[PDB]
RNA sequence: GCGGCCCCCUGGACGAAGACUGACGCUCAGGUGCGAAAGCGUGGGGAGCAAACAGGAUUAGAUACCCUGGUAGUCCACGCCGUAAACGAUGUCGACUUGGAGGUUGUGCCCUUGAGGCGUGGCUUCCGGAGCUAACGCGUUAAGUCGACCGCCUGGGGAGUA
């Protein structure tokens, strides 16, 4: 669980790590992995793009099936895999036939739980559903958006997605940011809230750690001159301006949700 | 081994769907261990308040003495099958006759 | 006088219906021991009873509601 | 014009005012006259009587509606309903039951701190 | 709550009998304590006090006026 | 709660004959069991106050026998401490 | 301190007849544990109410009461605080000393002959007898007559402050 790093040295000072024993002491399964380059925030043209990206560790792609396009047969889970490309541990469920797979491991999930997929299975924690037979007041997690697409809400640690309300072809979800949308009720989801849910706890303590996660420093602007950014310069930390990104637009209060052809799915914008 | 008063409704319509599902709710019990003491089927009959927009739902009263654990997973299928629409599982001394 | 020690009950019983709706006033409130005279355990009895069956639709909660 | 000859008849009394809101069966508001437009400001907004002016124009007010027979619901506390309820037959009327229908929660939330003074 | 006028039945009967319905149900005495917010303390101390009104009219009532004035 | 047929097996697991249930021995066995049973509960719900108060009690109970025990017949008492399996 | 209903886990007390151990008891410095509300910590929630705050009044003035708003907080989980008029302002255990009315929860006998009367328990509320007390009052639940052990007080203020 949480537990708190004792003072000897100042980035031992202030780091509370997250132990946990039910993870796979091991190297994981090979089969599913695959390579996986990092990319310091450059395209195909070469330049940065997005900025404070490059470094940290070297990581391996663990295929992950959201799908869940196997059905009616039962599966158990063998393991859990501290997965370094997410927040959630994932657990390598094993199905009767044969075959071993990496799904999201929910909350409630110990090693020789028994899952099953399909329209059929139960209203267990870890059973892939469609959104028609999942009652309303449920909380969910991993949901489709497209009837087959594989699952795109609800994939953090610890999040969760309540199914509010159903209008005949339409299952009104209430997001976890507070955003309300109708989804197809013949796309698939999974029963459950997502594992580790402590994962907000960690607070990394040094430099060191945000600069091995992967992440680059970041350099304010009021410090940078006027050609590199439009808060430059001045004679001692002079601001004077109303905050902008460094490309005009201005930040910290404008709304630029600007897709237009989906807005038919939002019942409510966040509050 | 306890004795359970199990009051529960059903839809006004699917008095079709009832009585079979009372026999695998036989399945729920005897299976195991359960002895249903009473099957006192009131029927439908008229709701002071509409739950769910309707009057006149369909009480079935059934009492059992069974293990607890079984009645959980009971519980498990009262909450989830679509049909049943209010269900209390009461605690009694004995299990009992008359109506 | 009461009705319950006069009867001999071990238990106000909710099913009992006839009673059940003579003992409430028509605006669906429990009329007290105090005017009544029902003795106190059959009181809490009868009023778990009353509890337990407006729960079941077999007693109005108020009168006035839809 | 829209003939609709029964109805019902809303009579929201606090200690401050009284809206008298007569209906149709459906919930279809026709017109109010409440105790504090007709003049009546202030202290004699909350006199009997001026439930009395409220529902003497109420009535008056709903003339091509040709409500003939009426239900009284009656809803709060405070000098309204009797004075009302008496000057709606006063003003010509067939008043067929008569209820009150104040909303009482159930211990459900707090209600505001004590006046001191 | 409600009251039901029937045929052949004067109103002004109907109006008192409104009247007997509002007094018995409680409509003016739980809104009366449902204005503003009693601590529990406050309403223990209503609760008590009453119960000393109770008995200190009662045994008053019962064994002082057993004897006359004049 | 401990109940009668336990009591019934353990009361002919430690007493004189069927009967005898006010000995000692007797009464730390019960005492044992029911704190077992109870150390089986309060691993969960972690806050039961109440409960804790009994528990406690019967803990300071136990521990009157056994030092009573201890003063009178200490041959008896060490045939306790190694059948029942406790520390002191 | 605990307030709708139901289940799951669980402490304690009381009553009946007995059966069993045989003084295993009482009190407790230090120690430990529980300890309303307010308050703190991190994370969720946030309807109503509402410190702070703003505005309108009242007033000589009104950063108060009154009115219209309203953020912490109230709520849940996990840790901390360790205080109150934490109040029957009444330590705990045990014993003895006439009464009447009541409440709650049992149980025994006689006839359930009929909503019964007849006796023994537990907890609890009111008035009063002897006795005590500065008086007020307490009065079988004593502040009566006693015994054991603990805590505490020594004029008011300084101050439960340094």
């Given at each position: 669980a949480v537990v708190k790093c004792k003072p000897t040295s100042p980035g031992r000072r202030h780091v509370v790590k997250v132990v946990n024993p039910e993870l796979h002491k091991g190297k994981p399964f090979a089969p599913l992995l695959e390579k996986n380059s990092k990319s310091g925030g450059r395209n195909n043209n070469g330049r940065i793009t997005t900025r404070h990206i490059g470094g940290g560790h070297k990581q391996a792609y663990r295929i992950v099936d959201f799908k869940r396009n196997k059905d009616g047969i039962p599966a158990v889970v063998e393991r859990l895999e501290y997965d370094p490309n997410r927040s959630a541990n994932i657990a390598l469920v094993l199905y009767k036939d044969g075959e071993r797979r990496y799904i999201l491991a929910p909350k409630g999930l110990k090693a020789g739980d028994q899952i099953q997929s399909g329209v059929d299975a139960a209203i267990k924690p870890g059973n892939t559903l469609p959104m028609r037979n999942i009652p309303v007041g449920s909380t969910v997690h991993n949901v489709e958006?497209?009837?087959?697409?594989?699952?795109?809400?609800?994939?953090?640690?610890?999040?969760?997605?309540?199914?509010?309300?159903?209008?005949?072809?339409?299952?009104?979800?209430?997001?976890?940011?507070?955003?309300?949308?109708?989804?197809?009720?013949?796309?698939?989801?999974?029963?459950?809230?997502?594992?580790?849910?402590?994962?907000?706890?960690?607070?990394?303590?040094?430099?060191?750690?945000?600069?091995?996660?992967?992440?680059?420093?970041?350099?304010?602007?009021?410090?940078?001159?006027?050609?590199?950014?439009?808060?430059?310069?001045?004679?001692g930390r002079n601001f004077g301006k109303h905050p902008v990104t460094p490309w005009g637009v201005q930040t910290k209060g404008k709304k630029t949700r600007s897709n237009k052809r989906t807005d038919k799915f939002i019942v409510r914008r966040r509050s | 081994?306890?004795?359970?008063?199990?009051?529960?409704?059903?839809?006004?319509?699917?008095?079709?769907?009832?009585?079979?599902?009372?026999?695998?709710?036989?399945?729920?019990?005897?299976?195991?261990?359960?002895?249903?003491?009473?099957?006192?089927?009131?029927?439908?009959?008229?709701?002071?308040?509409?739950?769910?927009?309707?009057?006149?739902?369909?009480?079935?009263?059934?009492?059992?003495?069974?293990?607890?654990?079984?009645?959980?997973?009971?519980?498990?299928?009262?909450?989830?099958?679509?049909?049943?629409?209010?269900?209390?599982?009461?605690?009694?001394?004995?299990?009992?006759?008359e109506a | 006088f009461c009705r319950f020690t006069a009867e001999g009950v071990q238990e106000i019983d909710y099913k009992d219906i006839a009673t059940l709706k003579n003992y409430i006033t028509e605006s669906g409130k429990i009329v007290p021991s105090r005017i009544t005279g029902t003795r106190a355990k059959y009181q809490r009895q009868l009023a778990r009873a009353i509890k337990r069956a407006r729960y079941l639709s077999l007693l109005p909660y108020t009168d006035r509601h839809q | 014009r829209k003939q609709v000859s029964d109805g019902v008849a809303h009579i929201h009394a606090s200690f401050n005012n009284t809206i008298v809101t007569i209906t149709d069966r459906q919930g279809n508001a026709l017109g109010w006259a409440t105790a504090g437009g007709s003049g009546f400001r202030g202290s004699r907004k909350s006199t009997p009587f001026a439930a009395q002016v409220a529902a003497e124009r109420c009535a008056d007010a709903v003339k091509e509606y040709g409500i003939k027979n009426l239900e009284v619901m009656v809803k709060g506390p405070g000098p309204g309903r009797e004075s009302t309820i008496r000057a709606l037959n006063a003003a010509g009327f067939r008043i067929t039951n008569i209820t009150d229908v104040t909303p009482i929660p159930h211990n459900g939330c707090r209600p505001p701190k004590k006046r001191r003074v | 709550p409600v009251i039901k006028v029937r045929e052949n039945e004067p109103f002004d009967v109907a109006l008192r009998r409104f009247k007997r319905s509002c007094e018995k149900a409680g409509v003016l005495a739980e809104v009366r304590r449902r204005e503003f917010y009693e601590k529990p303390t406050t309403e223990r101390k209503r609760a008590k006090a009453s119960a000393v009104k109770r008995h200190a009219k009662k045994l008053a009532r019962e064994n002082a006026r057993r004897t006359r004035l004049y | 709660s401990l109940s009668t047929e336990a009591t019934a097996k353990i009361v002919s697991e430690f007493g004189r004959d069927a009967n005898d249930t006010g000995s000692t021995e007797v009464q730390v066995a019960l005492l044992t069991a029911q704190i077992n049973h109870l150390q089986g509960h309060f691993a969960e719900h972690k806050k039961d106050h109440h409960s804790r108060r009994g528990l406690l009690r019967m803990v300071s109970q136990r521990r009157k026998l056994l030092d009573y025990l201890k003063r009178k017949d200490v041959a008896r008492y060490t045939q306790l401490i190694e059948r029942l399996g406790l520390r002191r």
């Open positions: 958006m497209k009837p087959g697409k594989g699952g795109q809400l609800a994939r953090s640690a610890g999040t969760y997605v309540q199914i509010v309300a159903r209008d005949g072809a339409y299952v009104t979800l209430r997001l976890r940011s507070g955003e309300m949308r109708k989804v197809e009720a013949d796309c698939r989801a999974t029963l459950g809230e997502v594992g580790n849910a402590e994962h907000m706890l960690r607070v990394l303590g040094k430099a060191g750690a945000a600069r091995w996660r992967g992440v680059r420093p970041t350099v304010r602007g009021t410090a940078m001159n006027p050609v590199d950014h439009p808060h430059g310069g001045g004679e | 081994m306890r004795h359970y008063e199990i009051v529960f409704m059903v839809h006004p319509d699917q008095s079709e769907q009832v009585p079979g599902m009372i026999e695998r709710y036989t399945a729920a019990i005897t299976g195991a261990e359960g002895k249903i003491h009473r099957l006192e089927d009131w029927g439908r009959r008229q709701l002071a308040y509409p739950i769910n927009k309707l009057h006149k739902a369909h009480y079935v009263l059934m009492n059992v003495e069974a293990p607890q654990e079984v009645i959980d997973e009971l519980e498990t299928t009262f909450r989830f099958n679509d049909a049943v629409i209010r269900s209390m599982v009461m605690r009694t001394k004995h299990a009992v006759t | - | - | - | -």
